Amino acid sequence: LPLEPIETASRDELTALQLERLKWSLRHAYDHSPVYRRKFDEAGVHPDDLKTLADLSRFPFTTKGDLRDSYPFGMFAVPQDRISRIHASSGKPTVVGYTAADIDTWANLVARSIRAAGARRGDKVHVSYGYGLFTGGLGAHYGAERAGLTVIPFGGGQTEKQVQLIQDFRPDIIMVTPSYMLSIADEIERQGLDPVQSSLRIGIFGAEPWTNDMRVAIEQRMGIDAVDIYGLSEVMGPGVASECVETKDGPTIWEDHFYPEIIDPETGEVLPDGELGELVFTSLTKEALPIIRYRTRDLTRLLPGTARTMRRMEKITGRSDDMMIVRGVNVFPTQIEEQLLKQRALAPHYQIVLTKEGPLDVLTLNVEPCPETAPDTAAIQVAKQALAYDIKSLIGVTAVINVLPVNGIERSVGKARRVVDKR
Amino acid sequence: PLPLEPIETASRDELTALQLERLKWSLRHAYDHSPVYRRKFDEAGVHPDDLKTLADLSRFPFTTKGDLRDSYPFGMFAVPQDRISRIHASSGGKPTVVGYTAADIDTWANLVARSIRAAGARRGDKVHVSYGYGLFTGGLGAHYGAERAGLTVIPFGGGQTEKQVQLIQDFRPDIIMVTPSYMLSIADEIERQGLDPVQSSLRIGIFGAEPWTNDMRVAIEQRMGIDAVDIYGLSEVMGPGVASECVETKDGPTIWEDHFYPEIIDPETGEVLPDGELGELVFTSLTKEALPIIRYRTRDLTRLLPGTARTMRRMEKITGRSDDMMIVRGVNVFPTQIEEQLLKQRALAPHYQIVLTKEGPLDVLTLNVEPCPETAPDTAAIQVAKQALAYDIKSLIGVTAVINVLPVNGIERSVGKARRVVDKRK
Ligand SMILES: Nc1ncnc2c1ncn2[C@@H]1O[C@H](COP(=O)(O)OC(=O)Cc2ccccc2)[C@@H](O)[C@H]1O
Ligand SMILES: Nc1ncnc2c1ncn2[C@@H]1O[C@H](COP(=O)(O)OC(=O)Cc2ccccc2)[C@@H](O)[C@H]1O
């Protein structure tokens, strides 16, 4: 229940903290990571050139290629014997590491994120994020444990068994991807139960893009508060930022630990708060793998603090990676998702399939009926036309709507694979 | 190196005293706070107060898996739900559910750390954890222990074997923590892609979760150029790290009896046996809060042996357990008995599975095996192998076995516990 002092501090208290910590972090990286010594020298800046927070623009960016070029351990700023934990993003994987203090800090931040989501003394947390080299499972695990809660460490897959245990154990909180949540909801219904009636009070969903419409759908279907938790393995894992449940106004960034920037992704210039651009993070307390101006490839804007003094990120729907170019039109999967979720006759499952027929791109949107609407041809043909129209007019691409049998699309077990490009 | 805890080689006299005080506490905690032990002790006519010495333990009733099953999901917990930090559960009736306070979790991490040190771990070691992460106790058990020991934890878990071998190459782990059956598949994949297993960074393997012969041990040790040690546990008592082998002696898991007090009973009468005599191994938790367990019958068969590298006693490597013991034409046989004969054949792989059928009055035991890749095309070598193997099984175990040589990779590979026996009779 109880907040940390730092969570209610003046913008000036925070600002002083960030400066002290950024000074430390830049110096630590320059002194102890051979990659940052080189990158800084080769960019012509010294850690001493930071006198204020604005000075951060002087320092070079880090990107995934920096890690890939120093695989496996080349970027670590402590000796291998102080590395307590390795994690790896399967997409050679990109490898990250943590001292025992880093693991402690990560636990504290995920515990903070779980409090922010409205957790209470006595709550059980059903963890469905993948356990392994992925950051999700073990991040949520240690965070729920640190928060003093009852942890049920299920991980991914075995969906019928997960539903069995949600009934039997009665967890209050589930920590799982939005796309897997929808499959879990399905299976509940299949087992002839009312998901609304489950014990779950709270979902903490993340690891992939999910629209606010997707949130409201899940909240309706499940009878829960559904909050948005963000981060990426290079920066720490889950718990870089997380939504306050009392405001649900985008994830609040824990910028006592992670200093955010928004840049023009073409030029590299820093933009004032409010402006759309690429999200960039600098770690302020990380030991094993300090990261300096890491380019997330996520597009969003910074916004003033509400439920906290710290700022929020606008929800992420667009990341550069999985943008599609179709007949010379730019489209994110979430743009398609928003149109799909307008059709109450269709499932919230889909895959986009990209093919070439002649010179012209074809976008095919694979979808399903709801089980109860499957036989209702009128309902489905309305959905199919409307969806087709909405994509044309709101997105500007012509989509072939392909209505499969129920269970025809392959269900996510973690991060959903929205797009199969075979062009 | 890594340092002993003082308790590990402190006098037996000191050990006995602290086991007594802890056992008096454990019995009282269970009786006062667990609805199940309140009922059990009352219905046996015993009170915690009745324990004056360690020998009085035989006065108290047994616990079995049935007791946990009947109290699913939480009926056996001895603290309020809000003090349960962790739930674990079986994957294979309904699952049996166990629980832990934060202190239980701490002690578990310390015990697995102790086991990892006993395996010869060094400052700077990386630990590759291939035990399954989730409701199973293995992965998160090993994980927390290796973390607590101050080592570099690589939390892979099970499956993705080709990627696991990639990262043993890339990361150069020093210790691997995995089931012996899966280890074998990992080594196969090393050879396949196409490296010299003996040339790995791996120095130590800490293998458990399932029965495996000392023959298997020497096989893996020779193949991988490692030390292989035996780590034991069961989720009802704690998880991995109830007992673990010292690398300097490799003489059976040393039981951590400062935390888990072992007995050996005659499984038929429940009579307590003297140390050295074979029987069923029974545990009583000494410091557990959430799920105190009193005289838990493990169904594992073994004997207690005097401590060597530690003050604490050892179990003999587990000779057998009731769960996958076969009765074949009147003869009781454990899968490991078959494993021991299989491992004599160098032309055959170390993978196997037993399938039982009926033909008229006869139990038919078919032992599915594979050739080595190298010897696969050597039909004469395979024939000599089938023949010697079938003979060894008849002459040494007294059973008639059909040896069924499958193609390479024809037996489905374990990523955790191998399913040794497929019983298709009725
Ligand atoms: N809440 C979110 N909204 C949108 N995208 C997200 C969100 N959270 C993660 N992503 C995307 O996935 C990346 C990183 O994937 P990566 O595997 O490195 O890290 C883990 O997904 C860490 C995580 C696990 C569980 C919950 C939250 C976060 C990030 O840069 C975003 O593009
Ligand atoms: N070293 C071993 N030798 C023989 N059998 C073992 C060994 N270790 C576990 N077993 C068997 O498997 C059970 C329990 O399975 P359960 O799932 O409850 O717990 C985990 O197997 C705990 C474990 C995980 C990882 C390593 C070691 C131990 C026990 O009663 C034995 O019959």
Ligand SMILES: O=C(O)Cc1ccccc1
């Ligand atoms: O490998 C990844 O980065 C993606 C992932 C998501 C969920 C579970 C495991 C892996």
Ligand SMILES: [Mg+2]
């Ligand atoms: Mg409800």
Ligand SMILES: [Mg+2]
């Ligand atoms: Mg719909």
Ligand SMILES: [Mg+2]
């Ligand atoms: Mg070697």
Ligand SMILES: [Mg+2]
């Ligand atoms: Mg052989």
